[PDB]
Write an enzyme that holds these catalytic residues in place. Sequence first.
Site, PDB file in Angstrom:
ATOM      1  CB  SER A  15      10.742 -10.888  38.819  1.00 13.53           C
ATOM      2  OG  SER A  15       9.562  -9.989  39.097  1.00 13.53           O
TER       3      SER A  15
ATOM      4  CG  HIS B 257       8.444 -10.172  34.237  1.00 11.35           C
ATOM      5  ND1 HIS B 257       7.855 -11.239  35.023  1.00 11.35           N
ATOM      6  CD2 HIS B 257       8.990  -9.407  35.099  1.00 11.35           C
ATOM      7  CE1 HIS B 257       8.172 -11.075  36.211  1.00 11.35           C
ATOM      8  NE2 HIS B 257       8.625  -9.779  36.284  1.00 11.35           N
TER       9      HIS B 257
ATOM     10  CG  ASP C  99       6.511 -13.886  33.974  1.00  5.32           C
ATOM     11  OD1 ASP C  99       7.591 -14.032  33.099  1.00  5.32           O
ATOM     12  OD2 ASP C  99       6.174 -13.409  34.993  1.00  5.32           O
TER      13      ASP C  99
HETATM   14  C1  LIG Z   1      -0.693  -8.620  34.622  1.00  3.65           C
HETATM   15  O1  LIG Z   1      -1.031  -7.679  35.340  1.00  3.65           O
HETATM   16  C2  LIG Z   1      -0.066  -7.080  35.963  1.00  3.65           C
HETATM   17  C3  LIG Z   1       1.330  -7.137  35.691  1.00  3.65           C
HETATM   18  C4  LIG Z   1       2.581  -6.364  36.407  1.00  3.65           C
HETATM   19  C5  LIG Z   1       1.898  -5.685  37.482  1.00  3.65           C
HETATM   20  N1  LIG Z   1       2.925  -4.731  38.067  1.00  3.65           N
HETATM   21  N2  LIG Z   1       2.764  -3.900  38.283  1.00  3.65           N
HETATM   22  C6  LIG Z   1       3.670  -2.835  39.094  1.00  3.65           C
HETATM   23  C7  LIG Z   1       3.326  -1.533  38.934  1.00  3.65           C
HETATM   24  O2  LIG Z   1       4.019  -0.700  39.091  1.00  3.65           O
HETATM   25  O3  LIG Z   1       2.250  -1.043  38.385  1.00  3.65           O
HETATM   26  C8  LIG Z   1       4.467  -3.420  39.697  1.00  3.65           C
HETATM   27  O4  LIG Z   1       5.386  -2.825  40.522  1.00  3.65           O
HETATM   28  N3  LIG Z   1       4.929  -4.781  39.838  1.00  3.65           N
HETATM   29  C9  LIG Z   1       5.930  -5.647  40.281  1.00  3.65           C
HETATM   30  C10 LIG Z   1       5.478  -6.151  41.596  1.00  3.65           C
HETATM   31  C11 LIG Z   1       4.339  -5.897  42.602  1.00  3.65           C
HETATM   32  C12 LIG Z   1       4.271  -6.835  43.575  1.00  3.65           C
HETATM   33  C13 LIG Z   1       4.810  -7.856  43.651  1.00  3.65           C
HETATM   34  C14 LIG Z   1       5.530  -8.323  42.834  1.00  3.65           C
HETATM   35  C15 LIG Z   1       6.155  -9.783  42.878  1.00  3.65           C
HETATM   36  F1  LIG Z   1       7.610 -10.007  43.056  1.00  3.65           F
HETATM   37  F2  LIG Z   1       5.680 -10.280  41.891  1.00  3.65           F
HETATM   38  F3  LIG Z   1       5.768 -10.487  43.837  1.00  3.65           F
HETATM   39  C16 LIG Z   1       5.986  -7.672  41.632  1.00  3.65           C
HETATM   40  C17 LIG Z   1       3.792  -5.684  38.936  1.00  3.65           C
HETATM   41  O5  LIG Z   1       4.160  -6.923  38.775  1.00  3.65           O
HETATM   42  C18 LIG Z   1       0.795  -5.331  37.730  1.00  3.65           C
HETATM   43  C19 LIG Z   1      -0.294  -6.297  37.309  1.00  3.65           C
HETATM   44  O6  LIG Z   1      -1.587  -6.202  37.281  1.00  3.65           O
HETATM   45  C20 LIG Z   1      -1.902  -4.941  38.461  1.00  3.65           C
END
Ligand SMILES: COc1ccc(-n2nc(C(=O)O)c(=O)n(Cc3cccc(C(F)(F)F)c3)c2=O)cc1OC
Length: 215
Positions: A171, A45, A89
């Site tokens: 990420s 991503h 991913d």
């Molecule tokens: C497939 O499903 C998903 C895909 C994407 C996101 N999603 N959404 C966000 C939003 O703004 O809505 C958001 O900010 N982040 C960033 C994020 C939030 C917490 C933790 C991390 C990390 F680094 F991975 F740990 C990244 C995100 O990944 C959420 C989903 O499922 C609810």
Amino acid sequence: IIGGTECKPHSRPYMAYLEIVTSNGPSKFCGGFLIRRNFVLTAAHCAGRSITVTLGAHNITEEEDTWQKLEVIKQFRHPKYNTSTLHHDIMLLKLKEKASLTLAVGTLGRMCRVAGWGRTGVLKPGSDTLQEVKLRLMDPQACSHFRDFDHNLQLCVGNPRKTKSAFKGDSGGPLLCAGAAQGIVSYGRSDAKPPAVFTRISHYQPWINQILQAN
Ligand SMILES: COc1ccc(-n2nc(C(=O)O)c(=O)n(Cc3cccc(C(F)(F)F)c3)c2=O)cc1OC
Ligand SMILES: *[C@@H]1O[C@H](CO)[C@@H](O)[C@H](O)[C@H]1NC(C)=O
Ligand SMILES: *[C@@H]1O[C@H](CO)[C@@H](O)[C@H](O)[C@H]1NC(C)=O
Ligand SMILES: [Zn+2]
């Protein structure tokens, strides 16, 4: 990284800072990690029109001799990467040249570590400095609310009783458990309540090896 500590500078010499350029928007930022002198592993991503990698960084605003800013010549996104589910991913980036080996730059319910330059809180901006936190690897039922999470593909990372978590900007970065890369930061909730979803590297090892041997 939420609830972490600032790293000892250059103590994680494989860490890579990605600036990601798209045609219709300003720069985006990711983490990543050096596995060969000319290859960096990260999340799909984090793909874009072009990418520049910074190795040797700690304080990403203060340029120093440790820095190697490197061109990416080709992006290799997993051929089954799905932009809705974030299944698979994972992405390989081939650097135009082999990086120099220095002190600051080199190739790479149990507790694991993750590091990055991401936001330190929901409304906090990206960290100037490399941050790291210790997170718990959770049984997969802890990530059930993420409807497209899959235990064979992905790790469930971060005790929901604590604040500590990777967050936006983190990420692509590696999850290390007992010194070894086991995961890649993929996704979680906007509110940053853990756990978060990480790519399970083991499943992708044959694909990683195919890409290296052809390039
Ligand atoms: C497939 O499903 C998903 C895909 C994407 C996101 N999603 N959404 C966000 C939003 O703004 O809505 C958001 O900010 N982040 C960033 C994020 C939030 C917490 C933790 C991390 C990390 F680094 F991975 F740990 C990244 C995100 O990944 C959420 C989903 O499922 C609810
Ligand atoms: C990183 O360097 C910049 C520029 O000197 C400075 O604004 C910032 O306070 C530094 N952060 C550290 C060393 O934590
Ligand atoms: C991505 O995932 C959705 C949901 O399972 C699927 O139906 C869709 O066709 C997929 N897209 C691609 C191109 O893989
Ligand atoms: Zn330094």
